[PDB]
Design a protein around this ligand. Sequence first.
Ligand SMILES: Nc1nc2c(ncn2[C@@H]2O[C@H](COP(=O)(O)OP(=O)(O)OP(=O)(O)O)[C@@H](O)[C@H]2O)c(=O)[nH]1
Ligand SMILES: Nc1nc2c(ncn2[C@@H]2O[C@H](COP(=O)(O)OP(=O)(O)O)[C@@H](O)[C@H]2O)c(=O)[nH]1
Ligand SMILES: COc1ccc(/N=N/c2cc(OC)c(OC)c(OC)c2)cc1O
Ligand SMILES: [Ca+2]
Ligand SMILES: [Mg+2]
Lengths: 437, 155, 426
Amino acid sequence: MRECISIHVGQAGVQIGNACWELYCLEHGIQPDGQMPSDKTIGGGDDSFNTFFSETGAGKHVPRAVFVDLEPTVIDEVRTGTYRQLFHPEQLITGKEDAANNYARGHYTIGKEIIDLVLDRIRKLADQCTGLQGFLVFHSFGGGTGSGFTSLLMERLSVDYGKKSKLEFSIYPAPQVSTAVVEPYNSILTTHTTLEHSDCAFMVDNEAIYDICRRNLDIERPTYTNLNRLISQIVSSITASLRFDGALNVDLTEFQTNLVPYPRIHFPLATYAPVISAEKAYHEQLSVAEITNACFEPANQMVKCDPRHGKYMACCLLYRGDVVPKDVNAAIATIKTKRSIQFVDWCPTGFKVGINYQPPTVVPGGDLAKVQRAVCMLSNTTAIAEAWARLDHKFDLMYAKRAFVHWYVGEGMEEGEFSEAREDMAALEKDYEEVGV
Amino acid sequence: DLGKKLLEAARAGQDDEVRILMANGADVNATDASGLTPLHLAATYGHLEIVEVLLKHGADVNAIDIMGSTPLHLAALIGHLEIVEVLLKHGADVNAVDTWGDTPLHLAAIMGHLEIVEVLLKHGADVNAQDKFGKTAFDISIDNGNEDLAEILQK
Amino acid sequence: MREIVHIQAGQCGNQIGAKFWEVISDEHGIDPTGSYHGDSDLQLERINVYYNEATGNKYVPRAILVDLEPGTMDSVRSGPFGQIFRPDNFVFGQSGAGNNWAKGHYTEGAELVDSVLDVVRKESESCDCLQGFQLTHSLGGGTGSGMGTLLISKIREEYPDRIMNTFSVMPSPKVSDTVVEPYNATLSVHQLVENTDETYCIDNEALYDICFRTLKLTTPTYGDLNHLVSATMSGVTTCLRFPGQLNADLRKLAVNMVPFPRLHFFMPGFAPLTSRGSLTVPELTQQMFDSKNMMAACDPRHGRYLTVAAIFRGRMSMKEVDEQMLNVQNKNSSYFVEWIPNNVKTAVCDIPPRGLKMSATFIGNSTAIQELFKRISEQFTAMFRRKAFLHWYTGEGMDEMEFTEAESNMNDLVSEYQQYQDATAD
Ligand SMILES: Nc1nc2c(ncn2[C@@H]2O[C@H](COP(=O)(O)OP(=O)(O)OP(=O)(O)O)[C@@H](O)[C@H]2O)c(=O)[nH]1
Ligand SMILES: Nc1nc2c(ncn2[C@@H]2O[C@H](COP(=O)(O)OP(=O)(O)O)[C@@H](O)[C@H]2O)c(=O)[nH]1
Ligand SMILES: COc1ccc(/N=N/c2cc(OC)c(OC)c(OC)c2)cc1O
Ligand SMILES: [Ca+2]
Ligand SMILES: [Mg+2]
């Protein structure tokens, strides 16, 4: 057992973090007050779920989570919600004036007024751990706090926790639910400043989740509640190996050994299947092969890109539920040939497989139907550079005219950081191209 | 010097003081340092009584300053409708041109004095007159989006 | 970001500011006594943005009343919502300005500005979380224009990081045939370019053409014009007064609408245009971008939109609104700048204004606003070329270079709108 600390920054990180911990408690059997009936050891434990949940003397299971936001509106709903009794009160840090969708406010002016308090509360959770292995950071790209404050936090965590791992669940901006016109700016600025300090980053394209809710969940206009419930379902499938028994991605160090061949290219692509609406409660049960085929369909990916346009450097399959290991081997043998899948020459063409024999848990009120078998594929492909190419283009269109730039220069930031961040992005696209895309 | 006193009297609107000075031989056609006569100031500051008085005592109705502004130019600019008609009744040049190519019709159209615009056209205002930039009174209405002004110029 | 300190200065500022407090109080359910006689608790969410909370469920507007003319003091008290203001927030002087921008800005108003500033602190320091200020005034006068811009600069010196917002009423010969108003407006625009973060351009010329030609009002009154002003100020402050999705922030509005600091003059629009006492989703979006619904005498089809914010109010399906806005962007793609991707933001609010079941408010940063500035500059140049009435201004201590610098600043402002109107992304 090696503990993981989850950090939620900004509205996007907090609201997705709220739905994630609700799903964790339903998967582990934890009640909103923190009571776990199927926990024999009281006051302590060596079990796998202890990597995410600490235990008090009264049998209370408290998440190892910190909620940070420069304004209190979003966190106040967590302070009065259903799971208000679950989280530590002193781990819900709120300011009074947010970053106003401005990277410079979150990183330089406003963020510095609360940065020392956030680290002291993170230090308190770290002192309770017997073997802290790393952090999980949830934040948005286009927000002022999610981009500016997170990069400042990632810089401080690398100094205090030098040898610890740090993973990201980032919210890629989408015009359908975007809040700011300068979100391409904040996305490029926080990437350049967090690239060195991050070991692995799972990007969540808001447009990809948007289309899945419209097409597969029959939702005419998806809200933040519909998106976050599907996102947390995929986040749980990714972190399930850290929370349960298994042999694939058992710790944070193994995540980058299996998915990150080189430090700068640490953006794996997540694919989830099946996504079935809850109104079809008597749907036909898809087989292991039919959900494995769906992992190589671009309409099921968490980031809108074309994987057959690029090359694979790593492929990991995480199954959940009624799954026989020989059925997976048969499904791979066909897909290994019947589909246009190309691995780079320097990578051993393989498919790592890990099976969890418990079917996924659905939250009451969600839009998903109960399934007896599901799969989450994590793959590092060069096709994910298309997301950077679409993001850098909107950056170039505005920065050429220096639009909205004065808002950033007026908050302690220098204009030279804009050109420095775009050059770092041009080298990143150049890193994917020199591998094969 | 009564010429300098008649300038200040015509501006402030002291009618009795204007009569006293002209009785003592004050130059009705005196000018200030910029070429403004008592008729210029009386027309600018809207003193209709002094306007009719000066015109009865040898005031040049078409005098110009260093910038070429007639009393009708200043009256059309500020918007003194009655003074405009009194000047025209005494032979004021309706198409006089200042150093910027502007006519009395240009200034009345720019400042939106529609009533004065209608009076100038009745007395024969040239609608084809161009300023230094080539704009006519019609061009000013089209470029300003003034539909009421363009309708008046399309009689 | 919550509390907003309202300030109204001058005869036009107090007049259009009184209508603002009458309309929004009807929407939030507040009687002139101050009690909350509403039927929905949605009217008390972020109610403290424009109101204080006194004992007895009594809500007091956070407004400060300024004017040099002592007659304006009794003009507000005798109104319907007249005695819902603090007697301590009435700051009035002995004599007026008489349409002289120099009197309000340098002499008379300089003696009363400190009397207002000390009242601003009492409201500001008693705020829980202040975000900015909004000012209603005209630019053609002497008090709201001369002292108004002076008061803005004095407030910014003590609140530098706060947002400054203004509702400026542009002069027009159709409503007021005074030849010194182009002097006052041009001198005030020289101040608004530097000391304000966002300015709504309410044009009396556009208001007259709406009442006279659209509303078929033969002799439009100030009440006819202010009916459109009060209906526009309510829509632009919809998010500032109700939850929805945009959580009401003057700063986040400016970050997303002002790409260049000098270009912070907004073109408001409203639909449907209704008279006094007297539409589908594809209908509201259509009129919202029509030249006949803009509160500024400018044709939006003569320029390009830098940023656009639209607020829909009433019962309507959220999906249909997203279809028409994307559809209008397609049919009118040539009127949006291609180097600002996704420059159109759509807002929605359940609570509509009274007397209406559906409405739409347009907030556009269009380059076509140069037509308005070219108009005031042309009137200014014609008057200044002949030095007419310039002694009325220099006698109060003003330098003649200030006129040449104010005209040079606005001509440069027009040139900047033209530079980006012709720029391409390639
Ligand atoms: N999927 C999802 N995305 C969200 C959610 N909330 C916000 N976002 C995204 O976050 C982006 C804006 O950043 P926010 O997180 O809302 O702002 P912030 O991090 O609080 O920083 P500030 O600008 O200071 O408020 C938008 O592009 C949204 O798409 C959410 O609940 N779910
Ligand atoms: N729309 C509108 N404009 C007004 C109103 N009152 C005055 N104005 C305009 O404001 C200008 C006069 O400025 P004013 O506010 O009276 O002078 P001040 O006392 O120095 O601020 C004129 O050009 C009017 O057209 C009003 O109630 N509504
Ligand atoms: C061109 O891109 C954008 C344009 C406008 C955007 N938001 N607009 C507003 C408008 C508001 O009131 C009118 C708000 O209430 C004060 C408001 O509070 C946050 C936001 C957002 C954009 O990404
Ligand atoms: Ca235990
Ligand atoms: Mg926020």
